[PDB]
Design a binder for these strands. Sequence first.
RNA 1: UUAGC
Length: 1264
Amino acid sequence: SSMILTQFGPFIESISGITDQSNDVFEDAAKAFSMFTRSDVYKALDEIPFSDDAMLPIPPTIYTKPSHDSYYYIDALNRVRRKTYQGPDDVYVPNCSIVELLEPHETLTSYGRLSEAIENRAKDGDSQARIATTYGRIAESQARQIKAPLEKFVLALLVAEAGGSLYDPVLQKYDEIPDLSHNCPLWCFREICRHISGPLPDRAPYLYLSAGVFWLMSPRMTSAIPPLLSDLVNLAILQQTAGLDPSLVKLGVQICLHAAASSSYSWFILKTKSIFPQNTLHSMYESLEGGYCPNLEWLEPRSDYKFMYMGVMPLSAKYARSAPSNDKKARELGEKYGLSSVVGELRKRTKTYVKHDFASVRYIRDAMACTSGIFLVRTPTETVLQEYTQSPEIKVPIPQKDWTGPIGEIRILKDTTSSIARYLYRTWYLAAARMAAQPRTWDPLFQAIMRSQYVTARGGSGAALRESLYAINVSLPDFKGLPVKAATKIFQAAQLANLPFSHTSVAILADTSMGLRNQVQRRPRSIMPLNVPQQQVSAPHTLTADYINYHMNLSPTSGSAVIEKVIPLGVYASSPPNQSINIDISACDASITWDFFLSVIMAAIHEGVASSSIGKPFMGVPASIVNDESVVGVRAARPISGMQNMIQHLSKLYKRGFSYRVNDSFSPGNDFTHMTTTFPSGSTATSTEHTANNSTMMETFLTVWGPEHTDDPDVLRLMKSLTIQRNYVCQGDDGLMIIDGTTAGKVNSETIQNDLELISKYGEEFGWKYDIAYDGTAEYLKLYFIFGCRIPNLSRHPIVGKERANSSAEEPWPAILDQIMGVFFNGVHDGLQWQRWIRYSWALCCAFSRQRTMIGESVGYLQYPMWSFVYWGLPLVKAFGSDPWIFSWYMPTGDLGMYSWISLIRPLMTRWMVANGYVTDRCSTVFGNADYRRCFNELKLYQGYYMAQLPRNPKKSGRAASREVREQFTQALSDYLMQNPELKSRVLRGRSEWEKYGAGIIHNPPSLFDVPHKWYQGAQEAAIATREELAEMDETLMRARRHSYSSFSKLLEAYLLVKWRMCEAREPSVDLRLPLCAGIDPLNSDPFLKMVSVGPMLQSTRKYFAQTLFMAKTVSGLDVNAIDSALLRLRTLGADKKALTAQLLMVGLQESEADALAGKIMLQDVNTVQLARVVNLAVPDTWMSLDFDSMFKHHVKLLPKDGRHLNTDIPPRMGWLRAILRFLGAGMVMTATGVAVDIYLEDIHGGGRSLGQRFMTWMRQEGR
RNA sequence: UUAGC
Ligand SMILES: Nc1ccn([C@@H]2O[C@H](COP(=O)(O)OP(=O)(O)OP(=O)(O)O)C[C@H]2O)c(=O)n1
Ligand SMILES: Nc1ccn([C@@H]2O[C@H](COP(=O)(O)OP(=O)(O)OP(=O)(O)O)C[C@H]2O)c(=O)n1
Ligand SMILES: O=C1C=CN([C@@H]2O[C@H](COP(=O)(O)OP(=O)(O)OP(=O)(O)O)C[C@H]2O)C(O)N1
Ligand SMILES: [Mn+2]
Ligand SMILES: [Mn+2]
């Protein structure tokens, strides 16, 4: 550690709260990090006096592995396959030797890559060579699933941990987290690596590079070492920053060692990933004596996902685990995988917790953080053959007699059918009719928005489309000479812009390209990049599904992302007397096939949509005629609408299946097209479609099936008490059944179990394998809840990991910083020990803030000041002579954040600046007689501030584009969007109207006429950058570092004029014994105190924020938030109604709606959040889990504590000021360590009025 | 070649 101490001494003290932080020391540390060689990090590890408790037997078979060759074979289709040994799953990367297949590297003689000789043979067609190349490429792919070299994270840990224990400012004592000499993952990392390197000077087992991965030429290396080491590093960092229990952490290391000890690390990890969750979370409190759980009320309507805290629910044996015992299966799993030692220890401990409190949930959390975080990996061929193969077993098919004759591609399900499909058909028919009935549906703008949804800078199987079109002799414009990426649906859109649906129809059956995705703790999933016509024709399906989810069920739309994964719902459902069954449907995509669902859904939509869509085109699709054979004998022609024409074509594809074109770049020679009937993921229907069937079937069960299959009075009573509208929330294939409790306690466990067995039996009838889980836990959207307490899953957030499906190289330097920030933010959301985490983040950042640059022997260096990370969101540990750890990680981001920390120590700064020569005769309004301009330029505070706001990736704009083809393109884009003249006429109106009432007021008019340009811009930036464009990026950042400044942004200079007075701490908003988020307990002072004083956000953030916009959606390409800002800004700037009416016309609205909303906006009392946008203020993400709405409303007094001040009074017409003022107050409160405090407006330098003009100046100057 | 939200 003397190696580390000597080289980072001063820096360590700065991020440990002992010494102030200075950019001079930060940048040096950066340079030290950059000069540390990989073997040096191991040399440093050697200096650690590890304790015996940090050691455990390392399996000798982790080193000696068999040849890879016996693990593969060539199949009947000549594709290189993984040869199974431990079951159908044994398809991942096998644990084998690999040195024998490498050629030493030219320079790094001790490291090696796959022999070029072997690849050439493989490329020639040699079976043995292909087998070896595949194994080589896949094993390499496995090692790449990390963000940067493991040594960088380790070195950072060493530097951060050299600071020793950290003193808690609030608790007033040092933490008792064991030092590194007790870190078992680290000890293993050093020992395993040292054992591999052996006599070799090079200490690294492998090198994560750009030229690819290279392996240390040791006969002890294994394809499993990269993943294993990656797991140990995460655990190493977490034991120190999450304050994890070392004893548990070892159980986690043991499993990993066993994974490396197995024949396939990846596979073993997958089969045992449930060990920690099963032996703790799903086995808590078989005995219960005390503790408290939340007591929440679900507000009406339940669809708002809004709850209110009502106190605490004392716990007793009355609430002990009533759900079935998983002991037997749990021990069986351990026995089968040689981990019964771990399982047992886990069970024995889980039993000692008889009180539900901070101690026990932290235990669960702790346990669940020890699960491997590797992104499982296997060759594309293997994913495709395992995912697009299995078919649903429809145990009770729809009788063939129950279909009518064909109506084109569809057959109506007779209304005499006795099949359960009867109900599935009614629901889709109803929704389809009502949706097509809505007037909006027929509005040109709406159809433009829909058509735009899939016009993105993402792929759409471009090539395949082109050829399916060539098959019918129809060539698409190639726009030869344009600097944009051709494999984008944006490019596709332009090619198809001027072609009749009849000419592009065939493309609906074109092949699908391969798209892959690796996930932590899950198998890789294949994806289908549908093409523009395929996406277009799918609208009907998507729209009807949306109608169901918005009007007929209780569902959440999103992918996820904490808090908007509706944390509140989880607290409620998991809180006694409430109970929840976690429903899931396995192989959902393979379960939605034509045979039962799609054939029915297609028919119901086609029929229910008939009367309202009649005689009309839809989204560019014409109406037509199709053969009609419904009635026996009677065979005629039927006039169908364009919307129906869509279902007609979509039905053709769903029926045939998808032609998945598989070009496995990891497996030489594995090129094949695989036909599959599994549902598409890349469809705009997918998510919403599955969410819809989910609720529909569950509704059918609870209403029909269930009741009809049991005469059990209790099961019938329970069932009758459940409605999909109140008690069943779902998203995609995930379901959460919430059984509200009574005063008599919770519903009988045995009755619930009966109910569930009926649900299971029910699914088999139509090919669905329900994955039901009744264990006293709530698990929805990968969020874990117990007794009202959320349990973050640290293992699903690998600190070092990163999905990398493709072979392409990582993004150029800068890019990594964003990733490091995201790592920080997860730690804040996951609840790690705030100080330990903040200090480590500083070490990690500093270790990635410097990069070597080239300009032609012009060897320089790009260095980000420490101040750039603050701007990005990382709080200061201690600056300007202030006390240590006064800043919380809830410090806002950007300007709002800069204003907050600076305001919290304004005087300190001034006093310090002066005391250090930074004095002047000019008295600064914010910094008194401090020479703040000369100070910030020297410390690189301005420099860093501006560097933070510059692009972290190369820009392609500026590429020479021949004006003519450039115009043809943007023209094509335009025609695609301006298909319907009515829309265009609308925008034109807004335009001439704008020149009269709005032009001049603001300069950011969002216009549909911008879309073509924004779209082109996107297709451009999607293409690969050039080494030159990379140089231009560095030059920009490097120029901003040279330049000197005299001020901050115009807005931040305005906020600084506002001074406050922090006062009395807020009273608790929730009980202090109440466990709300494991890890967030009295042991994690700042997060914990914030949670308690501020209170938890008890509503769905998506519902909440949906109430801060006048318009929810708009043509993809425009910004809903921009439009909302433009309108409020025009209002705030005194613009006339007609001006807002003009703005709305310009983004597609009908004059009537335009005038209506315009007139509505004018007279509205805009809420804080919504209004705060006029000046680009946004609720910080880190705040999302807290009750910020209440902080704004009741704890940020705008009336000075001692009455009214001339400067503080808010001008008559400047009421909007109050919204902006609330953010500034909140900013300071949230940034200060400890309890939320009530803050009071103390002063506004030039008065409110002056401030308003200052803001309005900014407003009217935006985009000049 | 590398999807929808
Ligand atoms: N002032 C410097 C010099 C080097 N490096 C880092 O060094 C790495 C590769 O170059 P080296 O060969 O390691 O640098 P040298 O300066 O030549 O080595 P030292 O003086 O011991 O000789 C990458 C580069 O960012 C750095 O950050 N700052
Ligand atoms: N923004 C960037 C990123 C990389 N490079 C160039 O790429 C070359 C090597 O790539 P890296 O692997 O990214 O640089 P290293 O110094 O070898 O180490 P790493 O980025 O961790 O620092 C040398 C460097 O000049 C550059 O000029 N500008
Ligand atoms: O990036 C993503 C991630 C999930 N998606 C959808 O959600 C579901 C299923 O969710 P999950 O449980 O994660 O996938 P399964 O195949 O059902 O995993 P398994 O049976 O172990 O549960 C299938 C997809 O349609 C999606 O479309 N895109
Ligand atoms: Mn599933
Ligand atoms: Mn799922």
